[PDB]
Design an enzyme around this catalytic site. Structure first.
Site, PDB file in Angstrom:
ATOM      1  N   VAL A  42      28.899 -15.271  21.839  1.00  0.00           N
ATOM      2  CA  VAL A  42      29.194 -16.576  22.433  1.00  0.00           C
ATOM      3  C   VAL A  42      29.264 -17.631  21.292  1.00  0.00           C
ATOM      4  O   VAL A  42      29.949 -18.644  21.412  1.00  0.00           O
ATOM      5  CB  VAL A  42      28.115 -16.938  23.497  1.00  0.00           C
ATOM      6  CG1 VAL A  42      26.717 -17.074  22.874  1.00  0.00           C
ATOM      7  CG2 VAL A  42      28.490 -18.212  24.263  1.00  0.00           C
ATOM      8  N   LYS A  43      28.551 -17.361  20.172  1.00  0.00           N
ATOM      9  CA  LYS A  43      28.412 -18.288  19.041  1.00  0.00           C
ATOM     10  C   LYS A  43      29.697 -18.478  18.266  1.00  0.00           C
ATOM     11  O   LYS A  43      29.794 -19.440  17.505  1.00  0.00           O
ATOM     12  CB  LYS A  43      27.281 -17.826  18.133  1.00  0.00           C
ATOM     13  CG  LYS A  43      25.938 -18.036  18.843  1.00  0.00           C
ATOM     14  CD  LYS A  43      24.839 -17.176  18.286  1.00  0.00           C
ATOM     15  CE  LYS A  43      23.546 -17.453  19.008  1.00  0.00           C
ATOM     16  NZ  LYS A  43      22.505 -16.465  18.639  1.00  0.00           N
ATOM     17  N   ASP A  44      30.718 -17.625  18.504  1.00  0.00           N
ATOM     18  CA  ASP A  44      32.043 -17.815  17.898  1.00  0.00           C
ATOM     19  C   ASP A  44      32.577 -19.215  18.230  1.00  0.00           C
ATOM     20  O   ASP A  44      33.227 -19.856  17.397  1.00  0.00           O
ATOM     21  CB  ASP A  44      33.039 -16.780  18.454  1.00  0.00           C
ATOM     22  CG  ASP A  44      32.875 -15.354  17.983  1.00  0.00           C
ATOM     23  OD1 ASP A  44      31.804 -15.036  17.369  1.00  0.00           O
ATOM     24  OD2 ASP A  44      33.808 -14.547  18.214  1.00  0.00           O
ATOM     25  N   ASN A  73      19.228 -17.741  13.712  1.00  0.00           N
ATOM     26  CA  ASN A  73      19.550 -17.761  15.144  1.00  0.00           C
ATOM     27  C   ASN A  73      21.030 -18.050  15.406  1.00  0.00           C
ATOM     28  O   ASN A  73      21.527 -17.729  16.476  1.00  0.00           O
ATOM     29  CB  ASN A  73      18.692 -18.805  15.866  1.00  0.00           C
ATOM     30  CG  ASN A  73      17.217 -18.484  15.891  1.00  0.00           C
ATOM     31  OD1 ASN A  73      16.770 -17.531  16.548  1.00  0.00           O
ATOM     32  ND2 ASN A  73      16.423 -19.295  15.202  1.00  0.00           N
TER      33      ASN A  73
END
Ligand code: NA
Ligand code: NA
Ligand code: NA
Ligand code: NA
Lengths: 288, 288
Positions: A42-44, A73
Site C-alpha cells: 500500500v506504501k507505493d 516502517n
C-alpha cells in the site's frame, strides 16, 4: 493498457471476496489487494505522491538528492519512484531493518546510512551537507492522509459504494487510515473505521476520532491469519495483512447478514519466505 | 473492481514503455508486466486454465487430488488455483528446486514429493494409487498454446494492435510463445517472434516455424539486465525478465525509428533476494 512507466500502475487495486475466511462471520468479508501494487505494498502510493507533490510545488527536480529518514516502517515507495523519475535516493535508518528490504532498496539505487533520534538527525545533517537535496519524511508530513483521501478512499467508494459497513486498516505510518476514513465518513458517516495496531516485537512499532476502534494484535495471531490467507484464499500476503484480517474477524462479528466488511491487505509475501511462510520458523517462534 | 477470488485478477497485465533500457535502440521498447500476476508470474495463466479446462471437460471436481509432475520449470499456478478452488495438490519433482519456491508451494497447501524420469514415473504411480486423482502436466499438454492464444496474445493485440514489429518471450514451458505467435501472426504475419533461450545452469533447462529466431542468453547477461530493469525502470523482476530484455536489445537493433518491440517480463524478484539482487552473490558468481 499501455503506460509510460511503472508508477502509472500503482493503485486501482482489486477487491476480492474472502469466501473461506468469512465463513465464521454473518457478514460478507472483502480484501483490498494493495500488496499487488508494483512495489508490493500500500506504501507505493505515498512514495510516488510525495515526489509528485514536491515536484508540483517546485521543491525538487530530477537529478536532486532525496533524503528519506525511516524507522524501517516506511516502504520502498520513495526509492521506487526515485529510481523511475531519476533522483538520487538516500535512506537513513536504525540497523534494525531486514536483509530482504535492504537488498531491494539497494537494487533500486538507494544509498542506506545505518545509525545506532540519530537517523532523523543524520537526515537533517545530510540535508545541509548535500547540495540540491530535500528531506521526504512520511512521518509528520501532514499530506499523507490527502493521497489516501484522493485515491485509496475514492477507489473503495467507487467499488463498494454506500453498501459498506466497516473498513479495517493499519495505523502505521498513519496516512492510509486517516485519508480513507475522512473520504468514507463524508458520504457514509455511519461507517465503522477499525484501526489495526500490531503489538508484537516483529510487526509492531517501537470526541469525534475518524478511527472508531483500535484493535491490538500480537505476532502469533497475525502470522497464523496470514498463513490462512495464503492457504485458503491464494493471497500471497505478508504478516500485516494477517493482522488486519484477524482484527476484521473480531470487529465484523457485530455486523449482520448482507452487511459488508472491507480489509486492506497492505503487504506481500516477498520479505517473509524465511519467516512466517516457513513452518520451521513458525515452530521455532512457538507459533505452531 | 470487486471480484469473487484472486484467480479473476490473473491477466490483463499492463505494458510499460522501457524509456531507459530502450535508449540505445532506434525503436521503442515495451515490457508486458506478467510478473505483476497474483502468483508473480506469466505461469499463473496456464495453472488456472488447466484446472478450468479439466473442470469443463468433467475430468476433475473440487475435493479431487491434482498431481503435477514438474522439472522445477513450471510455476505455482496449479498450487495457487488448486488452493482457491479446493483441490488437494501433489507436486513431484527432482531435489533441485529452491527453498523460496518450495516454501510458497507448501504454504499454498501443496504436498511435494522429491525424487532423485523418476518424478514423471512417481506421478503416474500416485495417479493409480490415489482415488479421484488426476495428472495435470504443463509439458506435452498440447492445450498450453491455446490459453496464450485466447488471453496473452489477445491482450497484446488489444493494447498495441497492428503497430507491433516484434515480440520477445521465453520458450519454457512452450505455451506462451506458441499461443502468442499464433494469435499475432494471424493478423500481422510480418511480426518477428523472438524466442528467449537461457543456456546458463541457473536460468536454463537441462519451413514455417511460428518462432522466427531463438536467442541464447547466458546467466551473467540475464542477471545484469535484470539489475538494469530494477535500477533504471523500477521493475521488480526476476532473472528470466533480464534474459528476455537482453535478447530484445540484441534482436530489436534491426528495427527502425517508430517501430515497436514488446518483451514479456515473466517473473518477479521474490525468489532472488539472496541471489542476483544481492551484490555479494553477483560478485561471488563472478558477474560483477
Ligand atoms: Na494498478
Ligand atoms: Na560540513
Ligand atoms: Na489483472
Ligand atoms: Na499399491
Amino acid at each position: 493498457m499501455v503506460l509510460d512507466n511503472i508508477l502509472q500502475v500503482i493503485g486501482k487495486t482489486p477487491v476480492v471476496r474472502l469466501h473461506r475466511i468469512g465463513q465464521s462471520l454473518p457478514c460478507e468479508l472483502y480484501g483490498k489487494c494493495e500488496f499487488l501494487n508494483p512495489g508490493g505494498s500500500v506504501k507505493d502510493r505515498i512514495g510516488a505522491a510525495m515526489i509528485e507533490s514536491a515536484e508540483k510545488q517546485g521543491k525538487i527536480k530530477p537529478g536532486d538528492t532525496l533524503i528519506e529518514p525511516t524507522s524501517g516502517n516506511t516502504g520502498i515507495g520513495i526509492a521506487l519512484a526515485g529510481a523511475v523519475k531519476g533522483y538520487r535516493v538516500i535512506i537513513t535508518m536504525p540497523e534494525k531493518m531486514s536483509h530482504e528490504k535492504q537488498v531491494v532498496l539497494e537494487a533500486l539505487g538507494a544509498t542506506i546510512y545505518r545509525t545506532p533520534e540519530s537517523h532523523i538527525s543524520l537526515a537533517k545533517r545530510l540535508n545541509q551537507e548535500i547540495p540540491n537535496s530535500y528531506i521526504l519524511d512520511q512521518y509528520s508530513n501532514a499530506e499523507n492522509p490527502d493521497i489516501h483521501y484522493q485515491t485509496t478512499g475514492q477507489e473503495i467508494l467507487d467499488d463498494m459504494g454506500e453498501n459498506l459497513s466497516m473498513v479495517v486498516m493499519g495505523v502505521g505510518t498513519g496516512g492510509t487510515i486517516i485519508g480513507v476514513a475522512k473520504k468514507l465518513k463524508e458520504v457514509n458517516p455511519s461507517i465503522q473505521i477499525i484501526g489495526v495496531d500490531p503489538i508484537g516485537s516483529i510487526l509492531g512499532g517501537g470526541d469525534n476520532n475518524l478511527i472508531d476502534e483500535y484493535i491490538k494484535i500480537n505476532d502469533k495471531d497475525s502470522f497464523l491469519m496470514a498463513r490462512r490467507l495464503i492457504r485458503e484464499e491464494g493471497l500471497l500476503v505478508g504478516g500485516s495483512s494477517g493482522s488486519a484480517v484477524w482484527a476484521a474477524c473480531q470487529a465484523a462479528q457485530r455486523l449482520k447478514e448482507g452487511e459488508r466488511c472491507l480489509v486492506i491487505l497492505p503487504d506481500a509475501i516477498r520479505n517473509y519466505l524465511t519467516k512466517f511462510v516457513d513452518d520451521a520458523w513458525m515452530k521455532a517462534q512457538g507459533f505452531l
